[PDB]
Design a protein around this nucleic acid. Structure first.
Lengths: 141, 74, 129, 149, 91
RNA sequence: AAGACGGUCGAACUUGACUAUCUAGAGGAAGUAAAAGUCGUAACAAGGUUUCCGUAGGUGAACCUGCGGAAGGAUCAUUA
RNA sequence: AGCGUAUAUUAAAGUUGCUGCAGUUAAAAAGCUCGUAGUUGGAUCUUGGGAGCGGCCGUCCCCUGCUCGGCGCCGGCCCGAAGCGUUUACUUUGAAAAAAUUAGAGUGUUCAAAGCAGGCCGCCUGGAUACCGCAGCUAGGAAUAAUGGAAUAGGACCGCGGUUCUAUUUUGUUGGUUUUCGGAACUGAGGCCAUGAUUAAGAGGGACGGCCGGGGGCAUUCGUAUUGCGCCGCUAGAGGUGAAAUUCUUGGACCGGCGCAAGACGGACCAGAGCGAAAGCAUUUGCCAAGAAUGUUUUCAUUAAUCAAGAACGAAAGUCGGAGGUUCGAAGACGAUCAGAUACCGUCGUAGUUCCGACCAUAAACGAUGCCGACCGGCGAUGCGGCGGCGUUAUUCCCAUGACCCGCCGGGCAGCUUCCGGGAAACCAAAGUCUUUGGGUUCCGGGGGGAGUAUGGUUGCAAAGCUGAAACUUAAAGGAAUUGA
RNA sequence: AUGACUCUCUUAAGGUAGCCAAAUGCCUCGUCAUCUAAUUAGUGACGCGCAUGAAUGGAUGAACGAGAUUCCCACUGUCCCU
């Protein structure tokens, strides 16, 4: 504190408000631009129509082609690059199958090598692709 | 005093902001009904009023006594 | 401008204890600071002192015992309660064994050990441990 | 320090402790007032009067010797001025500087010394309304000022 | 009520003649028609009558100044240069 | 009782501007990121003409040259 | 009997900082000064007893009064009522504050979460209390922080002398009026109080005295040089450079002379010296308003500090119209240089360089360091002012004024020394008095880029100036110090 | 594809700011976009410009016009058809 008076109380209080808009983890919070951009719009999961399988290269030191997808969502009708996780699970998306996309760890901030990609898979039409890996459920014909 | 048969009065006081253990000035104007039997009033004179039934849209006060400004003698 | 007197004087004596003079002259004098001074010289944190009436305001020449780590003031003088004096002392004196908080009550300028016996809150002036 | 320039100077008179009047000073408090009426009838200020006493007619402090200080003995009878001695000067100095920015149009300094004299009359004046010596719709206007040297 | 945000006497010209001539006319078409204090009598009624030829309409005295103002500028120091060559010779 | 002036209260539809959020685009351009691309090296050591600020003009491109700064300089210094 | 993943939110963060952070170089203090709202404001008026309690010591009780009903006492006193006795804030109590939630008593649901029930071989027992901001209502205290009162006395407190409106305390019944007292309002002459003005801040404003400074503004006198011309010599090269050449020369260039002419700039003396609000300011005289410091047993009496909006000034470049064009010199033309140089150097040269008028408002506008206030070490210089003291020197004739010599005090620009202290260190007598965290107040930063960008509003003739985002992009930018190469 | 770069012949230099199928571009009814059911038209960009280019003036612009040109709402015997 710096303006020590006994009846200042507002001088003091018009200054912190002013200030807190400089704060990032807040302004990112207190304007409508964060939710205008966002694909999910404000949400923890949101389903979508796949449309092609796609390999993304990884960034340096590392190298290895990373296996992703390109989804169109429902609500917005918007197009995201996503990312499969497990080994040999891409053989389980057929083109234009439906997936439950999720977030990926750190909120609007990617993980590791792969550029742009902020989203990933939990389900592939009413049963989780975790299970498919193990084999605890298998696919309908 | 400009309105005919009436005046407006200033009423100052303070308000406890609790986070910061301090105060901030606050004011509330209100209109008052000065009735000509008080033949002499100026700006700044203290006035003592009391609640009563609505004399207009925005009047619910009537004047009871002048209490004069300091100095003022000449 | 010298907007507030006490805290001229109270740093002064502290800054004459860190250094360590046999006695300290403190300039314009009041009936709050001489008062405060007698509250200190009632628990032994200084010794006996002389005020010098020059026809303006006084000067005071305290004699400083080296039993005085720090004296200090609080500003502005907040308005305290009997329910709100734990959480000064519990954040302004060092230990639960020693320390004192001078404040001003209607029944006199005195230390926080006594205003709990007379059951009276009020304002706040400074501390000494 | 000084209100209107960096100077943090110091330099004043220092009045003594005992207040009662000295020995040789014969002049009685009801003999001296002829001298304060006579040096005030001459176009000379109660400060200026306050000197001429304290060099030639040897006296400690005029207050002590009477009861009342020098604005009081002049003004209740009818010999003192209408504006304070200190406001007269500031104005007179105003009127020798703005007159200087006539034919020396480009003397920029003067202009910056003339936006501190008018911040010292107004300021001295608004005091003088609250203790009630100036009538309250008073106005230092340089236009009119020249009149009252 | 203020009636024009920058056009002095030169409202009397509207859109004509182009910006920077209307600015250039403002500085001459305000000084020519002014009044000045007659130094002789003291009043405030010098006033032009034609090109560089001026007339107090109180004490009927008449002067030769500049076309558009009452002193020309180095005729103010032409008087203070002839006055100063009255110093060099007389001794 | 049916109905007819006059009165209020008055939804709805037609005509205009004011205002809010998203949206198409010839052509013009910024920026950002991507393993063996091309011309030159301005910068870091007196980086081979000391460096940087302001402002003006030039030059394929880093960048120059004018005028006044500042050492964040390569001198805390130089002799009656 | 669960445990992971995804997103919202808190604690972590003293990474929003009221408690409680930063701002010389890490991100960051307006180029300067004034200024209204805001916040913040020196000291000074009631202080010593007598009893009462137990072991000089610590407690309690005594420090404004002027119609009725009871403590009775003798129209006199003590005591309860009927009404009142500068005004605020602060503070201790008193009402007034639905439940349920929280806290908390009590009770063995078989234990807990919970509930409002239960216990004794008809009856005994509960269904508790506390907390419930601010605002308003009520009674005590009167320290600390705000407002008042007696000055051309339109002043307190007392008595005396009229006038005018006037309920009946009174003239057994009926006419009426002064009688008689109370209850409004005016007013003349008096007596009386100790009759009524805190203090003059190591706060400010202003006066006055002899000084001081490249402070500012208008005229004025000087100085050598560079450049152009006019003559008088003698003669062949003269510029330029690391080395050459473009450029000048028997059409007399360069060096030598005596003249004249203009357009710049003020050498050495010039200092870790000076004055200014910042930018800034150096030839001799004359004049015109200003200034800080010192000196003062002069006067006013809190008149002050900091400052959103608004205002005055603001190098150098850059603009608009004249006046002026010696030197230098962005643009351009050549000569050398190099692989190429539209760069260094070299030969010329426009805008510009200089005055008078009005715009523009930014610079590493720097001490990369807010202004006012208190305090905390030692020395050697220095500038301005005042004071004390041996002795040389000047005006000779000494009075005091100048010049040299050793201190004392006040304000100024800097140094040196050090375990006052601080810090991340470099380093700082401030960058100190900071977990031993509060003297008052103004601007401002919150990981890097994107980006001082887009846009809109604003100001300008123009360049541009003030305000000023977002999507996207990334685990490091960065600071001070070590060893190496 | 493309050409930032590199050389090489030449003149007194060799077209620097800007500005275009124009009241100025042969090929030409140049070609992408805009207005129509359909457009050698009108307007918005692209420059290769036969022969654009700076007081032989270059680029821009409020007001103005019995001046040259396009399209929309109004209104009509100009047309259907007299």
């Amino acid at each position: 504190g710096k303006c020590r008076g006994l009846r200042t109380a507002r001088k003091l209080r018009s200054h912190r408000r002013d200030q807190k808009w400089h704060d990032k983890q807040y302004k990112k919070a207190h304007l409508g631009t964060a939710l205008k951009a966002n694909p999910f719009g404000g949400a923890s999961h949101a389903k979508g129509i796949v449309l092609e399988k796609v390999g993304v290269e990884a960034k340096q030191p590392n190298s290895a082609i990373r296996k992703c997808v390109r989804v169109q969502l429902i609500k917005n009708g918007k197009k995201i690059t996503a990312f499969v996780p497990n080994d040999g699970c891409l053989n389980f998306i057929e083109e234009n199958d439906e997936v439950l996309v999720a977030g990926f760890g750190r909120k609007g901030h990617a993980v590791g090598d792969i550029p742009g990609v902020r989203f990933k898979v939990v389900k592939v039409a009413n049963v989780s692709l975790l299970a498919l890996y193990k084999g605890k459920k298998e696919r309908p014909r | 005093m400009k309105m005919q048969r009436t005046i407006v009065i200033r009423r100052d006081y303070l308000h406890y902001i609790r986070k910061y253990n301090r105060f901030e000035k606050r004011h509330k104007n209100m209109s008052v009904h000065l009735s000509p039997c008080f033949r002499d009033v100026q700006i700044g004179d203290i006035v003592t009023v009391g609640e009563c039934r609505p004399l207009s849209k925005t009047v619910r006060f009537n004047v009871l006594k002048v209490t004069k400004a300091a100095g003022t003698k000449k | 401008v010298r907007m507030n007197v006490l805290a001229d004087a109270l740093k002064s004596i502290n800054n004459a204890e860190k250094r360590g003079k046999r006695q300290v002259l403190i300039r314009p004098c009041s009936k709050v600071i001489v008062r405060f001074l007698t509250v200190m010289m009632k628990h032994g944190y200084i010794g006996e002192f002389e005020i010098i009436d020059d026809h303006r305001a006084g000067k005071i020449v305290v004699n400083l015992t080296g039993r005085l780590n720090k004296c200090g003031v609080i500003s502005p003088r907040f308005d305290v309660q009997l329910k709100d004096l734990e959480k000064w002392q519990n954040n302004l004196l060092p230990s639960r064994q020693f320390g004192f908080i001078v404040l001003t009550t209607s029944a006199g300028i005195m230390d926080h050990e006594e205003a709990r016996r007379k059951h009276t809150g009020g304002k706040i002036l400074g501390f000494f441990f | 320090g000084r209100m209107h320039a960096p100077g943090k100077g110091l330099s004043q008179s220092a009045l003594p402790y005992r207040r009662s009047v000295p020995t040789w000073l014969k002049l009685t408090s009801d003999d001296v007032k002829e001298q304060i009426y006579k040096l005030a009838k001459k176009g000379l200020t109660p400060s200026q009067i306050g000197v001429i006493l304290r060099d030639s007619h040897g006296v400690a402090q005029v207050r002590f010797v009477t009861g009342n200080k020098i604005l009081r003995i002049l003004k209740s009878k009818g010999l003192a001025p209408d504006l304070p001695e200190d406001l007269y000067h500031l104005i007179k100095k105003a009127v020798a500087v703005r007159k200087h920015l006539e034919r020396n149009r480009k003397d920029k300094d003067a202009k910056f010394r003339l936006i501190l004299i008018e911040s010292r009359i107004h300021r001295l004046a608004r005091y003088y309304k609250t203790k009630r010596v100036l009538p309250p719709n008073w106005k230092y206007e340089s236009s009119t000022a020249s009149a009252l040297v | 009520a203020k009636r024009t945000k920058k056009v002095g006497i030169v409202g009397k010209y509207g859109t004509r003649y182009g910006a920077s001539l209307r600015k250039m006319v403002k500085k001459i078409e305000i000084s020519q028609h002014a009044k000045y204090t007659c130094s002789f009598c003291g009043k405030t009624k010098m006033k032009r009558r034609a090109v560089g030829i001026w007339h107090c309409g109180s004490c009927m005295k008449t002067v030769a100044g500049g076309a558009w103002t009452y002193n020309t500028t180095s005729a103010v120091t032409v008087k203070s240069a002839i006055r100063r060559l009255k110093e060099l010779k007389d001794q």
